[PDB]
Design a protein around this ligand. Sequence first.
Ligand SMILES: [Fe+3]
Ligand SMILES: [Fe+3]
Ligand SMILES: [Fe+3]
Ligand SMILES: [Fe+3]
Ligand SMILES: [Fe+3]
Ligand SMILES: [Fe+3]
Ligand SMILES: [Fe+3]
Ligand SMILES: [Fe+3]
Ligand SMILES: [Fe+3]
Ligand SMILES: [Fe+3]
Ligand SMILES: [Fe+3]
Ligand SMILES: [Fe+3]
Ligand SMILES: [Fe+3]
Ligand SMILES: [Fe+3]
Ligand SMILES: [Fe+3]
Ligand SMILES: [Fe+3]
Ligand SMILES: [Fe+3]
Ligand SMILES: [Fe+3]
Ligand SMILES: [Fe+3]
Ligand SMILES: [Fe+3]
Ligand SMILES: [Fe+3]
Ligand SMILES: [Fe+3]
Ligand SMILES: [Fe+3]
Ligand SMILES: [Fe+3]
Lengths: 159, 158, 158, 159, 157, 159
Amino acid sequence: SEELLDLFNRQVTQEFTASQVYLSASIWFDQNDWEGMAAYMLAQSAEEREHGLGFVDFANKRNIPIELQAVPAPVSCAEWSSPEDVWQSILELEQANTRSLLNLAEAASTCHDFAVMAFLNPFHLQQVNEEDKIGSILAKVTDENRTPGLLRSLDVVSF
Amino acid sequence: SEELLDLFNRQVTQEFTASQVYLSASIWFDQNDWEGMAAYMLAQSAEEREHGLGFVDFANKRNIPIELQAVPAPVSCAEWSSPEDVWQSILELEQANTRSLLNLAEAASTCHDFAVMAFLNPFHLQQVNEEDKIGSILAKVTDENRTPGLLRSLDVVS
Amino acid sequence: SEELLDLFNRQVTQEFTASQVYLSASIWFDQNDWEGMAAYMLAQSAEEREHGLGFVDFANKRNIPIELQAVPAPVSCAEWSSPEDVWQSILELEQANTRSLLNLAEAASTCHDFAVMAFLNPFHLQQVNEEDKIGSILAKVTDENRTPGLLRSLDVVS
Amino acid sequence: SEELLDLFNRQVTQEFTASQVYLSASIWFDQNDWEGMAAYMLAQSAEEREHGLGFVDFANKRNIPIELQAVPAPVSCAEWSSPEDVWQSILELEQANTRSLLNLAEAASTCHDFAVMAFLNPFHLQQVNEEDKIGSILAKVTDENRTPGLLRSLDVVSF
Amino acid sequence: EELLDLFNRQVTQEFTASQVYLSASIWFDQNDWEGMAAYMLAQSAEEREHGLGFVDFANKRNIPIELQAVPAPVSCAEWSSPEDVWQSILELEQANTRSLLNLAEAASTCHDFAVMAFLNPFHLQQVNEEDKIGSILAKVTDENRTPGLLRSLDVVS
Amino acid sequence: SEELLDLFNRQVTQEFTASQVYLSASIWFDQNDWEGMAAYMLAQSAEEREHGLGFVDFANKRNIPIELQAVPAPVSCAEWSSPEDVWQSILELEQANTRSLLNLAEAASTCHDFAVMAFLNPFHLQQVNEEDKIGSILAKVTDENRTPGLLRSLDVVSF
Ligand SMILES: [Fe+3]
Ligand SMILES: [Fe+3]
Ligand SMILES: [Fe+3]
Ligand SMILES: [Fe+3]
Ligand SMILES: [Fe+3]
Ligand SMILES: [Fe+3]
Ligand SMILES: [Fe+3]
Ligand SMILES: [Fe+3]
Ligand SMILES: [Fe+3]
Ligand SMILES: [Fe+3]
Ligand SMILES: [Fe+3]
Ligand SMILES: [Fe+3]
Ligand SMILES: [Fe+3]
Ligand SMILES: [Fe+3]
Ligand SMILES: [Fe+3]
Ligand SMILES: [Fe+3]
Ligand SMILES: [Fe+3]
Ligand SMILES: [Fe+3]
Ligand SMILES: [Fe+3]
Ligand SMILES: [Fe+3]
Ligand SMILES: [Fe+3]
Ligand SMILES: [Fe+3]
Ligand SMILES: [Fe+3]
Ligand SMILES: [Fe+3]
């Protein structure tokens, strides 16, 4: 189960990578005066960190060694020029979180590690809800930004 | 020094000038049926007057003589044509409030006037917040006013 | 009527002028350690500004164009040398406020402007109350100040 | 740093010295039946002690060595004959507290000691207020004492 | 601009410190020091909040922020007792303090009164933090002179 | 009686001296990270100052003229090297406060000063309690310090 222990360790890196990418989106939104979208992103940055800390806590309890890796620099911000660019990157980010969790669950399954598979269940369900929510926001964003100025009313109203 | 006392007095005039220019903006907004923006400007007129009163109160305590100057007539209101023009003038007003506080702080720093520097700290931080907030409103106004009527939404909501 | 529009604008100037004169007074009092009288002047400074704002609000609703004028530098504080002098100048200030209101009401009457006359009624009555209160304070200040120190012992009616 | 550490110690001394001088003034007032002015001085004695204690606490946290110095016998009370003499000595005392703080800040500024400067900020503003208040009381006392017996009104009604 | 660079660097420093505290909580947990682990975990949260505060002020003040990589913590590999961990944490807070002071010096040279004012509560916070960490290190060092006695500090937390 | 006046004044000096010495103990404890013992000594510093204030207040009422003397610099902290040293010095301090109260009572008894004797009664009983309590803590400190680290473990708990 060297694969399982390694992937578990890497899941913590992935969640924290996502936290930093959300924070990067917050920053872009704030610098561009989308304070409502920036607040959503900031909240999600905290939530991803909490997912990471969940993995760490479970690993400690289950004697899965955790070695904390570099958290990479977010790079998508270099290329964002509209809110749609940001939300699309966040959709991609959540799809990558989901795939990383399914890979982990597959190694757990192969190992017959019932405890890990149980631990992961609510995370699988959470990612379903998160991808749906982000996809829905992206669809709204994309539609509203067909008329100049209109997407500014999503920011002020929702968020 | 002379410079320090002169600048402290002029800060009072600056806050009260800002108060009057905010009042002028509320009037333009009101006459043009932007009651939301008018109410915000009116609230800011009151706030700038409280900043001036703050400086007057400190000056009295610290024995800095205050002589109240004329508060000039607001000038920008004659040439405003849209809410974007108002908001841009208000941003510039806040930037001038900020520069004036920084010049005051400089003069206090030169005199080693630690009490004045301490008194000014929250005003420096308030200005950061105010410039950010006004700059953000201005960006929103500029963006929404690209579609006829849409800005009239900002007003009625927020 | 040009006369009624002009006078309505002048009333705003007069209220704000009064606001600054009261502030000047609070300053004189505070610098001379009359903290109770200073607080009273500060409160009256706020109240005059509220009158001005009420005029501006009504003008906006009634489509009377307001152009904000310079608010002049208070000058009586160069001559004040006792509390009596300050209160006397405050009395004369309120008498001028009352006169400008009466002149406005006169123009409104001439024009048969019933709404303006109704709007002014509470201000006419308020001026009765204010001239009465300030007059009574002045008489008390004048009487107490006939014994050294005695006036001080009643600013501590803070 | 020699001078900064010396001045920081001396500040504790100055606050406790002021505490003692205010106590002396409470004594003089009490003995002369100014119980209101006496209670005020006694409150100020406690307040100055609190300032000194705040300096001691900060010094402990910041590893600034404190050695407590003698608190000298107050000597102004030997010469006070009227309430006016006492309040003038108390004004001068506060003026000396203020000067001492400004000297300490100057030494902190020279050392680029940003933490000490920040700690001092509320003390700088407190001194403005105290000098103002003591200054105002002195003017009232000097005015009211121009009529025999009138100053006993300040004591009883106020205070 | 040395000031803009140093302001960016402060965000990185705080997040670095967040990770290092997380690494400490891990070492403590794995070695059954649950009380000390809880403390480090709370301090990890706190460092991240400091970093967030600098990002927020920078956004308001138009100081461009670009998030850097958060380096992996390195000290855990060599910790062998609680004393080692708390020593590393004291050092970490000393570095936090030094970086804040460097930032304040750059701000001072630029006459940037707003940045200097914003940093004031952080300078005071560092004083309290280095004091508290110092004091814990001292207790830990003392109590660990008797086999098993340090487990008492933990369980009374 | 000049002796009674002199002893009454010396009592004030002794209480204030005790206040400073307790403060010095708070500082040595704080510097050496004994925060609990430091808090205790700080509280006792305030209590001693209150005793002094109670003596000043009684003296003013009874027309016993008080002249504040110098409060000497505490010097025992230069030689304290363990908590036992500090607590031993505090026991000796309380024993000196008791002796000065007994000397004052003796002088009041000689003068048949019934009011001063009555005034002193609560302080005589308070000293019994204080010497008992300090003696008991000193015993505990002395015993616990026989095992490396054990004393620390109880600063943390007690106090
Ligand atoms: Fe923002
Ligand atoms: Fe959650
Ligand atoms: Fe996640
Ligand atoms: Fe997620
Ligand atoms: Fe309207
Ligand atoms: Fe302002
Ligand atoms: Fe402003
Ligand atoms: Fe005042
Ligand atoms: Fe009103
Ligand atoms: Fe009026
Ligand atoms: Fe009036
Ligand atoms: Fe008495
Ligand atoms: Fe206090
Ligand atoms: Fe206080
Ligand atoms: Fe003080
Ligand atoms: Fe003081
Ligand atoms: Fe555990
Ligand atoms: Fe930090
Ligand atoms: Fe920290
Ligand atoms: Fe401590
Ligand atoms: Fe007590
Ligand atoms: Fe007691
Ligand atoms: Fe005692
Ligand atoms: Fe005692």
